[PDB]
């Protein structure tokens, strides 16, 4: 996860037991990467030749310093012997993870906003304007009825529509149509974009077989 791991060895003497007088190991104390020094975690010689120790932040000694190298067991991966801060396997994945997330966000908003077949009603503006200025007029009552009836317009055993058939010009006064996309829909098929990026991420961890001696077993042996 972080290219690096710090473990400190502590030894203690035996009081009573089979090997009284000898020294055990009390704890292989794990030092979390988050509690380390954020500025320089690892300190070198006056030159950049070797390592003298590892620094831990002073904020880890609170509730809500340099440890010598001889006391510390360092493990790192992804780099040569000259890279103290190893390369996390998540480096490389990062750009693919940024894209994978963004695409998934577009799918959710895209499916919510696909108002195909929505109901549209056209009414002469004389009725709409009269209702707005005369709340106690017959036009106002019918407008308030439409605002509730149209919301509840589902498909069932008694669904139908009845509209006046008056005509003033080439277009009719009253109409009811169901909208649809006037042209062509989306083309990019965001589904296969995500699948490519998922296999891109899992391959770095050797666990890409879930998308369907092995690669996964050989990868575990490296860590061991």
């Amino acid at each position: 996860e972080y290219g690096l791991s710090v473990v400190e060895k502590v030894y203690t003497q035996i009081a009573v037991g089979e090997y009284v007088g000898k020294y055990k190991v009390k704890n292989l104390a794990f030092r979390p990467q988050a509690s380390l020094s954020r500025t320089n975690p690892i300190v070198y010689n006056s030159d950049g030749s070797a390592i003298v120790g590892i620094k831990q932040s002073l904020s880890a000694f609170q509730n809500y310093v340099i440890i010598p190298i001889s006391r510390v067991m360092l493990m790192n991966t992804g780099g040569s012997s000259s890279q103290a801060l190893g390369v996390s396997p998540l480096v490389g994945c990062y750009r693919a993870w940024r894209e994978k997330i963004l695409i998934e966000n577009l799918e959710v908003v895209g499916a919510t906003k696909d108002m195909g077949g929505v109901i549209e009603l056209k009414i002469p503006s004389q009725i709409l304007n009269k209702a707005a200025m005369d709340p106690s007029s017959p036009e106002a009552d019918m407008v308030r009825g439409l605002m509730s009836d149209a919301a509840n317009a589902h498909s069932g055993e008694q669904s139908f529509f009845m509209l006046p058939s008056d005509t003033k010009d080439n277009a009719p006064q009253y109409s009811m149509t169901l909208k649809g996309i006037d042209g062509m829909g989306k083309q990019y098929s965001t589904a296969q974009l995500i699948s490519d990026r998922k296999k891109s991420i899992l391959d770095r961890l050797g666990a890409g077989f879930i998308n369907v001696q092995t690669i996964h077993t050989q990868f575990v042996q490296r860590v061991n």
Partner: peptide
């Protein structure tokens, strides 16, 4: 000329009134 265009389901006050 204040209430020409009506869109349903985009207001909590109107949604609960019908519900």
């Amino acid at each position: 000329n204040s209430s020409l265009v009506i869109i349903g389901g985009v207001r909590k006050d109107e949604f609960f009134r019908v519900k």
